[PDB]
Amino acid sequence: EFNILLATDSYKVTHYKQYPPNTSKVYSYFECREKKYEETVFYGLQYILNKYLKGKVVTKEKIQEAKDVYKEHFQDDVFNEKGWNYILEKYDGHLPIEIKAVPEGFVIPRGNVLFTVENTDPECYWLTNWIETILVQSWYPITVATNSREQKKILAKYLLETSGNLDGLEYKLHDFGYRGVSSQETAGIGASAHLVNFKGTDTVAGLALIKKYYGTKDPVPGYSVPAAEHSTITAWGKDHEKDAFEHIVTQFSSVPVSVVSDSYDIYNACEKIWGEDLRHLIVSRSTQAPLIIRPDSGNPLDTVLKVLEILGKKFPVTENSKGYKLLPPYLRVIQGDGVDINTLQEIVEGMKQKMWSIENIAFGSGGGLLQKLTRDLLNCSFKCSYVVTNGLGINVFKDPVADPNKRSKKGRLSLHRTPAGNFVTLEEGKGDLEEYGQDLLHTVFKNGKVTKSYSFDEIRKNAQLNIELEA
Amino acid sequence: EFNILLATDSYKVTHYKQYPPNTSKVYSYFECREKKYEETVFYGLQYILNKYLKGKVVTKEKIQEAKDVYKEHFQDDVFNEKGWNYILEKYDGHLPIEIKAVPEGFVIPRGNVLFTVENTDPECYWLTNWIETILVQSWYPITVATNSREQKKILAKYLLETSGNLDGLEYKLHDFGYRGVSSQETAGIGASAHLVNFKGTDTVAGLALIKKYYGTKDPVPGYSVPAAEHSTITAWGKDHEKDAFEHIVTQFSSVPVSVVSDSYDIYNACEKIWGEDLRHLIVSRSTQAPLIIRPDSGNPLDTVLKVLEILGKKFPVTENSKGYKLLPPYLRVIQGDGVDINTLQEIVEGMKQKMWSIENIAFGSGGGLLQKLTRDLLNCSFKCSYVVTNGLGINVFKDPVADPNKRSKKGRLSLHRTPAGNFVTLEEGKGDLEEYGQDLLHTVFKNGKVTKSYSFDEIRKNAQLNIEL
Numbered sequence: 001e002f003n004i005l006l007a008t009d010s011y012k013v014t015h016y017k018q019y020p021p022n023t024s025k026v027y028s029y030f031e032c033r034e035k036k037y038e039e040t041v042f043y044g045l046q047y048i049l050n051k052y053l054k055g056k057v058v059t060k061e062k063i064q065e066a067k068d069v070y071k072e073h074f075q076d077d078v079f080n081e082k083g084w085n086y087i088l089e090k091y092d093g094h095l096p097i098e099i100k101a102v103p104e105g106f107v108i109p110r111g112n113v114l115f116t117v118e119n120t121d122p123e124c125y126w127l128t129n130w131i132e133t134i135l136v137q138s139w140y141p142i143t144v145a146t147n148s149r150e151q152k153k154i155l156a157k158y159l160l161e162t163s164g165n166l167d168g169l170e171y172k173l174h175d176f177g178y179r180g181v182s183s184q185e186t187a188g189i190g191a192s193a194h195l196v197n198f199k200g201t202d203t204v205a206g207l208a209l210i211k212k213y214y215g216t217k218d219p220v221p222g223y224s225v226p227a228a229e230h231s232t233i234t235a236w237g238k239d240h241e242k243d244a245f246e247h248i249v250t251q252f253s254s255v256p257v258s259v260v261s262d263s264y265d266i267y268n269a270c271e272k273i274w275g276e277d278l279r280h281l282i283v284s285r286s287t288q289a290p291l292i293i294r295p296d297s298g299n300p301l302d303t304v305l306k307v308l309e310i311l312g313k314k315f316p317v318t319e320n321s322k323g324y325k326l327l328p329p330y331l332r333v334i335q336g337d338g339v340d341i342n343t344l345q346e347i348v349e350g351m352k353q354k355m356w357s358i359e360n361i362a363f364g365s366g367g368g369l370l371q372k373l374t375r376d377l378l379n380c381s382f383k384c385s386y387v388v389t390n391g392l393g394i395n396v397f398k399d400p401v402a403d404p405n406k407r408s409k410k411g412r413l414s415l416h417r418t419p420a421g422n423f424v425t426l427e428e429g430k431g432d433l434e435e436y437g438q439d440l441l442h443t444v445f446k447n448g449k450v451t452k453s454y455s456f457d458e459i460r461k462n463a464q465l466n467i468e469l470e471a
Numbered sequence: 472e473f474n475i476l477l478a479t480d481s482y483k484v485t486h487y488k489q490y491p492p493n494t495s496k497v498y499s500y501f502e503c504r505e506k507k508y509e510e511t512v513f514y515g516l517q518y519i520l521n522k523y524l525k526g527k528v529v530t531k532e533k534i535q536e537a538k539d540v541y542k543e544h545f546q547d548d549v550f551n552e553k554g555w556n557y558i559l560e561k562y563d564g565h566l567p568i569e570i571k572a573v574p575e576g577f578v579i580p581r582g583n584v585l586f587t588v589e590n591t592d593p594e595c596y597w598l599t600n601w602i603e604t605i606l607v608q609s610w611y612p613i614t615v616a617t618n619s620r621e622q623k624k625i626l627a628k629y630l631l632e633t634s635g636n637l638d639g640l641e642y643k644l645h646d647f648g649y650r651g652v653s654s655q656e657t658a659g660i661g662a663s664a665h666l667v668n669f670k671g672t673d674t675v676a677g678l679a680l681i682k683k684y685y686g687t688k689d690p691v692p693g694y695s696v697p698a699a700e701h702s703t704i705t706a707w708g709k710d711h712e713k714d715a716f717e718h719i720v721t722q723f724s725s726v727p728v729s730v731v732s733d734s735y736d737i738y739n740a741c742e743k744i745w746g747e748d749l750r751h752l753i754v755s756r757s758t759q760a761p762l763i764i765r766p767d768s769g770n771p772l773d774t775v776l777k778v779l780e781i782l783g784k785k786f787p788v789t790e791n792s793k794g795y796k797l798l799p800p801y802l803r804v805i806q807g808d809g810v811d812i813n814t815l816q817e818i819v820e821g822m823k824q825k826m827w828s829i830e831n832i833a834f835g836s837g838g839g840l841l842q843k844l845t846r847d848l849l850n851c852s853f854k855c856s857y858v859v860t861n862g863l864g865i866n867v868f869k870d871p872v873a874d875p876n877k878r879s880k881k882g883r884l885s886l887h888r889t890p891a892g893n894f895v896t897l898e899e900g901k902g903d904l905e906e907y908g909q910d911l912l913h914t915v916f917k918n919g920k921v922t923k924s925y926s927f928d929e930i931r932k933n934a935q936l937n938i939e940l
């Protein structure tokens with residue numbers, strides 16, 4: 001069972017003895033620190049609040065286990081038994097903490113306050129930063145959601161340019177990252193973040209997370225289609241690739257089906273097997289059930305362009321109203337190897353240069369989508385900005401001489417609309433001057449209870465692209 | 472509750488319809504595919520076997536739940552309900568799978584078989600690759616342990632060169648990565664993989680994992696010391712940094728204490744605050760309880776060197792027998808910002824250039840150690856190499872025309888010591904010829920039961936550096 005007393009960085013165990021004497025309040029905030037990715041999608045805090053922070057999170061047993069662990073971990077007794085006991089006895093194990101946050105799904109420019117944390121009991125001044133570690137892990141769903149949205153922006157731009165519309169945009173980037181992430185828990189979190197922007201996923205773990213913690217009107221938030229892997233093609237034997245292909249597309253004759261085609265020779269597979277030997281099985285398929293040919297190796301751009309040129313000569317190509325080439329509706333391509341935000345851009349631009357519509361292709365991404373990201377990408381960071389000691393509030397901050405990029409904000413913070421309709425973060429309690437209207441943060445957690453929640457449908461709406469929003 | 476029927480890539484739900492008819496056996500293997508990082512530490516499988524694969528993992532309720540989810544997920548009825556029913560009825564929900572693996576901790580060159588997976592009942596040919604997704608996640612503890620070990624190699628080389636020994640090597644790289652990883656579960660797994668090589672960690676989650684799944688003779692596998700953060704310094708006010716420092720070092724006067732010193736001006740803090748105003752509180756400290764000064768911003772190399780030069784002029788420096796400069800034993804430095812394998816190398820080389828012993832410094836690493844890694848780094852990969860169809864075994868593989876690096880191995884595999892004492896993977900069942908020694912892969916899982924386990928102590932022993940031996 002999860003124990004919040006054992007879910008912090010070790011050194012934080014010793015912090016209650018390092019704050020100024022008579023400190024009654026510690027107030028801290030989270031931002032994606034300023035100075036690509038000029039704006040971030042705020043998503044994932046609600047998961048952490050519900051799974052880890054709400055309700056009775058302290059018991060006599062959890063206190064004793066933490067005590068015994070830290071005794072050996074530090075080779076000394078430095079653990080704050082009395083402080084944790086106080087929470088157990090006074091509040092029945094419910095955290096005396098208030099957290100305020102921007103609504104989930106909101107798209108906010110870098111350098112803005114996203115959430116704030118403070119203790120609501122003066123005895124629990126040390127509690128605010130004890131929970132830094134688990135709250136800061138929100139960097140991950142934020143970063144996945146943000147990077148996934150940036151890829152949607154690229155896809156939207158080129159789909160609109162080459163086709164005249166955005167039909168099917170939300171299925172253009174499929175999550176293939178289940179095997180390439182660091183754990184089962186990470187898989188569920190990351191896949192959910194991607195589903196903020198898209199509807200295609202093979203990372204099943206994401207579905208149950210959204211259903212439990214966020215909720216959608218629809219039965220599931222994400223979808224998949226039948227698809228082969230190398231084992232189901234190569235198992236037939238090297239001389240029987242065609243037999244495998246025929247069996248698979250015949251088994252899945254009335255639903256869309258993806259078939260990895262590069263086991264031995266992608267170009268032969270496209271031109272001779274699909275393009276000649278099995279062509280009669282492809283041209284008979286329905287628009288609702290296309291064959292989706294999947295290259296999976298080689299230079300991504302070069303391979304996509306050559307696959308398209310091959311198919312364009314074996315199948316009847318049309319020219320859409322924008323002047324771009326379009327495969328028949330029973331035949332599509334998915335590129336699911338080497339795809340990240342950089343190569344995605346290079347592929348779609350290269351397709352556009354060669355007059356291929358983005359209608360023809362979809363992308364899959366695994367490691368690039370869910371694993372190749374760090375806290376450093378958006379500079380997600382939690383810092384103390386305000387304390388009260390001897391009854392006096394002081395504005396605190398760090399400001400390292402050799403890195404102005406690491407300077408933190410001062411004092412009590414609030415988030416506001418500017419006269420032009422943008423975001424601004426006010427420091428030093430200046431929000432109380434009321435020159436900038438109401439604070440846009442909401443209390444989302446207070447004294448062990450979740451006080452404000454968002455459905456996954458609301459989050460998706462908040463996270464929409466401006467291009468989509470242009471009705 | 473975790474449901475194995477829901478813990479695979481979606482498309483694998485459809486694969487039982489795609490394999491050749493009359494297939495009784497699907498045999499697959501995991502390797503860190505060839506084409507730095509020439510050898511990998513095998514660690515983490517035992518965690519997965521115990522937490523996810525062993526015992527009764529199939530129930531009626533789990534089958535129904537999966538059926539319901541997949542109906543909506545695919546907008547179609549594809550789902551091998553009968554296959555899963557069979558496992559439930561015939562084997563009380565235990566997986567009819569055999570897994571053979573190299574012992575955990577083993578250090579193996581790239582491009583060798585590390586573990587193999589096969590069904591033990593012909594009805595369950597589809598099950599071997601169902602569990603690919605969960606098994607392949609072993610890439611993470613493998614890669615963390617491997618990358619951590621490579622950093623230990625660098626530290627050892629430079630510590631030996633500048634000091635003549637390896638004293639304290641196992642405390643030279645501390646795990647600061649708890650806040651920088653993607654989840655609580657990842658935190659525990661990653662921290663445990665680092666502790667294969669070192670003993671210093673702030674990622675508390677790793678301790679409980681090792682105790683539950685591996686075990687150590689000592690009470691805990693990893694340790695920490697009291698340390699400040701920016702909040703405990705800055706809370707005192709901008710004009711009171713010295714007061715914060717004095718309070719903290721005095722609270723922790725008889726144990727090592729790390730104090731972040733870059734809140735406002737690291738160089739001022741080292742030269743005027745530690746080096747003058749509070750010098751008297753430092754030079755009095757025990758050798759077992761030094762002050763550990765922690766810079767946390769700026770160019771990692773330039774900052775470490777400037778800090779050492781400042782400290783060397785305010786405190787009595789000696790020259791060791793190798794000719795390198797050494798701070799007094801009550802004063803040490805930790806660099807815990809921007810450290811990864813590349814920058815670690817650049818810092819120790821830079822220190823050696825300026826005649827500073829590696830004895831003087833330790834390193835902390837967070838995102839670089841536990842998060843900035845992918846499955847692509849060592850090319851961790853799981854592929855089918857052997858199937859039996861109509862009673863005939865056939866060796867199977869992929870070999871993409873445009874990428875020879877992705878060619879996979881053929882047939883039944885085994886791992887052997889070579890006459891010169893190296894490793895070789897034999898393909899096409901050639902291991903049965905017994906021209907080499909015994910197969911180094913051992914059965915670790917069979918039909919729902921974990922059949923061979925390793926302690927964390929054994930794993931650390933297996934993962935030792937050559938220079939340590």
Ligand SMILES: CC1=Nc2ccc(Cl)cc2S(=O)(=O)N1
Pocket residue numbers: 176202224225226227228229258259260294334336364366480481482
């Ligand atoms: C549906 C589908 N699923 C996948 C999952 C993982 C990978 Cl790695 C590849 C695919 S696909 O491209 O065959 N399509």
Ligand SMILES: CC1=Nc2ccc(Cl)cc2S(=O)(=O)N1
Pocket residue numbers: 171172173174199200201223224225256258290292332334362363
């Ligand atoms: C053509 C195509 N269709 C799909 C339909 C549904 C899903 Cl969930 C995914 C795809 S695709 O991206 O593989 N390409």
Ligand SMILES: CC1=Nc2ccc(Cl)cc2S(=O)(=O)N1
Pocket residue numbers: 642643644645670671672694695696727729761763803805833834
């Ligand atoms: C000098 C020093 N001592 C330590 C003792 C124990 C641990 Cl666990 C870590 C360290 S250090 O690496 O911060 N530096």
Ligand SMILES: CC1=Nc2ccc(Cl)cc2S(=O)(=O)N1
Pocket residue numbers: 009010011647673695696697698699700729730731765805807835837
């Ligand atoms: C003991 C110790 N713990 C830390 C944990 C996280 C960070 Cl980020 C920094 C440190 S330390 O360098 O103060 N030493």
